[PDB]
């Protein structure tokens, strides 16, 4: 039918709307987790640099 | 007939919308797996942060 | 040599019809036999695929006079989207009827309120490369240190009809070829009854960076037939002896390590591709 | 009837608006994924520098008890 | 009367619906392209996340070795 094509297409469209909305919110959560992992990564490399400095001190001191 | 061009546009739109449904689904699955992966990476990040901080603490204490 | 054509044009608003006049063509090349040609004029509307009209055959004349008129049942509201095509053909008894020269008038520029009649110099007709076969998009990612080649078959579109009475049953088979020998044959799933199949299927191979410039990747789109040998729709190849967009994508994969590059590619005919595969 | 063609027109425009919402949703998706790609690039940078610094510290601590 | 205007109203509204369908086709095509690019970006970021996790693993092993060396110095 002619109206049935519209109803089917409309149903599929709204379905992909729901799915894509869930996906977009999932990408919001992913953005939060990536900001947190960004901060933890920067702080981690900073502390690793400090531990490299202290390790250099202890090496040049005890060797 | 113009109604024929309209219905053809409707059919093409419908099929493309279905393709967008498959794309949305695979996309969602990949997003979920990458979120779990980010969780693992953050756990390892906290563990390595603890180890590095403790090792630097003892290393600084051994000064002398 | 560019000839001339004298045409008439008028619209009948009462019966909603297009009156096309073929008067005479002038300055025709000496095609066909020696000295004189055999011209006949085929007239048709560009958007419509309706039955093409053709004038009478005039024997041995470079300046033929037709003085014929045709009628096209066309609504005036839709005529804004149409274009009139007048093609002057040459007649050959034992050979293909070579076209002498055609030209087209867009109906959006014609004022049918006043009777139209014009001389127009003919132009050499454009030619199509081949029937529309289709495009296929996929991404290429290469990491030299591990030697892993990730080919993510993304999708395809505008594929040619294969099964009789139906659209297509497409699937993708990638062959890793070298020295004219098939090595690894991978294939994707069958997406039934579609002209725009979607895969998003990742594949992987072993390619050391010492042989990267000596391997060929053959992406072949084929149609599945329930019974019999599955006819092939088209195929492309990247790597050695690659040309144009293929060498472009390969160069992008080489210039971009540890990163995927998504790209479209125009399918070519299996015969010419297999010919380009030395 | 003009009521029939007009209602058909209304349903068609409704489908168009739904497809517009899905469209803007897909574009927003691509944008967010892009920005996340940038942040991921930065995280990868920090992690690599952490790999280098950790490797240096481990080398020195290994060479200290020698 | 308004009979002619009614017929032309039917053809006009039909034209608006048809062009609406054309707009639909363009919009779903653009959505299609943006979706594909989104998928490829997700692949790149995914492999990058894998190599980042493996990097965190190597950091963990190396830092464990340095912890052992510090326990030897102690
Ligand atoms: Ca969360
Ligand atoms: Ca969180
Ligand atoms: Ca001839
Ligand atoms: Ca002849
Ligand atoms: Ca077939
Ligand atoms: Ca078939
Ligand atoms: Ca396009
Ligand atoms: Ca992954
Ligand atoms: Ca992992």
Author numbering:
A (entry chain A): 27 to 89
B (entry chain D): 141 to 204
C (entry chain E): 141 to 418
D (entry chain B): 191 to 256
E (entry chain C): 9 to 82
Extract from the study:
We subsequently successfully applied our methods to the previously unknown crystal structure of the complex between synaptotagmin-1 (Syt1) and the neuronal SNARE complex, which mediates the fusion of synaptic vesicles with the synaptic membrane and is essential for Ca2+-dependent neurotransmitter release. The Syt1–SNARE complex crystallizes in two distinct crystal forms with morphologies that were indistinguishable by inspection of the crystals.
